[PDB]
């Protein structure tokens, strides 16, 4: 059984250097033709290939990132390290390392190369956020209005993830939509949480927001304005 | 470099259906192509290697065929765990490219979004910033287009949006879009509009308000 696992800092600041380690078990980087590669996935985006290293020590890099990447192996520790320099916000992504089989051998003779055509086992992945922002609590603002009515709370400018939001201390669940946060160009996150109700219920509505990182709890009652 | 284009980018289906996803390469990649299935929150999982070989431990409903520039993955009888995003990967040329992915989600009757526009709170305005949010609630299919207009000027580069995951009961999606402006710029205009295009809407719907109107 082959397993891989990524480790490194969850948060990194722009211009800094990011070092990611892939520790694995079940194979050796001294085994014939084996490879270990790195692939990343920005939130909501497609997979992007970064680099790979083989047991005979040949290395290859994405041409778009070549100047900022270094991949290396430590055979005796069963680890592969990928160093990315000068990171910027667009480098925020989940980073995965993965195993690549070498050709099948028969009495130590390569006879099948078909198994090298895939990365067959992957690590769980490591989420890396690149922002020069420091732990900060959100500002919470009201969002106020088939014949459904909508209202919500805008949880703005906080760092880092995550934040939790519930409605009426947990009693309101139907019609609730808490969207995934977006990382603003400022380096702070922002999210909305809304709830739809029969245009008659306008019943009281309060969003309970909690950002553990900054010890910031806020309850904000939201109503249909006009005094 | 080499381009790998997946089709369709998104696909709706129901348990028991037969689906086929295709991947086309800009130059021939021989048989060096792999297919993966990735469920939300998890790493991609290898299904098919070398264009058509079934990876060990992978269920037989998955099948891959093709070589050169055109490949296909077919799942013969879709199971609930197959609602996910699929990717193809080429390993003939460096860099080892991935396709754009194809999202497979639960099929359901077309539903237009209920749209709502929220002006910025007076509380936010006092801090100097103005957030205008637009909500597209419970729609299907997933693709939707939101266009912000301020006093009829098309907005660009000053909004961000996020979409919920498919609802497990509804099978619909919801989308939140935030337009952000300084309090000053905000004050220099009156009509804030959120224009929405979607398959379930005969023509675009616009929700708006005039700033400061009371």
């Amino acid at each position: 059984r082959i397993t891989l696992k990524e480790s490194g800092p969850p948060l990194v600041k722009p211009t800094q250097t990011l070092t990611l380690t892939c520790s694995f078990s079940g194979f050796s980087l001294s085994d014939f033709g084996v490879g270990v590669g790195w692939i990343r996935q920005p939130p909501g985006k497609a997979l992007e290939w970064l680099a790979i290293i083989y047991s005979d020590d040949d290395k290859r890099y994405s041409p778009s990132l070549n100047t900022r990447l270094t991949i290396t192996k430590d055979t005796s520790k069963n680890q592969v390290v990928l160093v990315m320099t000068r990171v910027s916000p667009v480098d925020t992504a989940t980073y995965f390392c993965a195993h690549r089989r070498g050709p099948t051998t028969l009495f130590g003779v390569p006879i099948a190369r078909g198994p090298v055509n895939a990365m067959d086992v992957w690590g769980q992945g490591i989420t890396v956020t690149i922002s020069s922002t420091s732990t900060k609590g959100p500002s919470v603002f009201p969002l106020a209005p088939g014949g459904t009515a909508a209202l919500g709370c805008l949880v703005k400018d906080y760092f880092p993830e995550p934040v939790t939001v519930s409605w009426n201390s947990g009693a309101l669940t139907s019609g609730v939509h808490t969207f995934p946060a977006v990382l603003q160009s400022s380096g702070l996150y922002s999210l909305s949480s809304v709830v739809t109700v029969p245009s008659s219920s306008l019943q009281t509505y309060t969003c309970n927001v909690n950002h553990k990182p900054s010890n910031t709890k806020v309850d904000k009652r939201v109503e249909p304005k006009s005094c | 470099a080499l381009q790998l284009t997946q089709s369709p980018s998104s696909l709706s289906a129901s348990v028991g259906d037969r689906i086929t996803i295709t991947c086309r390469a800009s130059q021939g990649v021989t048989s060096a192509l792999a297919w993966y299935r990735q469920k939300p929150g998890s790493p991609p999982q290898l299904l098919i290697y070398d264009a058509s070989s079934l990876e060990s431990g992978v269920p037989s409903r998955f099948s891959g065929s093709g070589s050169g520039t055109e490949f296909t993955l077919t799942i013969s009888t879709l199971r609930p765990e197959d609602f996910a995003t699929y990717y193809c990967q080429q390993l003939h040329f460096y860099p080892h490219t991935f396709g754009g992915g194809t999202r497979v989600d639960v099929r359901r009757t077309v539903a237009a979004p209920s749209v709502f526009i929220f002006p910025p709170s007076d509380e936010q305005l006092k801090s100097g910033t103005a957030s205008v949010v637009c909500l597209l609630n419970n729609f299907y299919p997933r693709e939707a287009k939101v266009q912000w207009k301020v006093d009829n000027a098309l907005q660009s580069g000053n909004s961000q949006e996020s979409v919920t995951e498919q609802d497990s009961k509804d099978s619909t999606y919801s989308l939140s879009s935030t337009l952000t402006l300084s309090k000053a710029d905000y004050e220099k205009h009156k009509v804030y509009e959120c224009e929405v295009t979607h398959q379930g809407l005969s023509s675009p719907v616009t929700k708006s308000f005039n700033r400061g109107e009371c």
Binding site: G33, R113, V116 | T30, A32, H92
Partner: peptide, 6 residues
Amino acid sequence: ALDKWD
């Protein structure tokens, strides 16, 4: 640039 095994 052909893959390692091609």
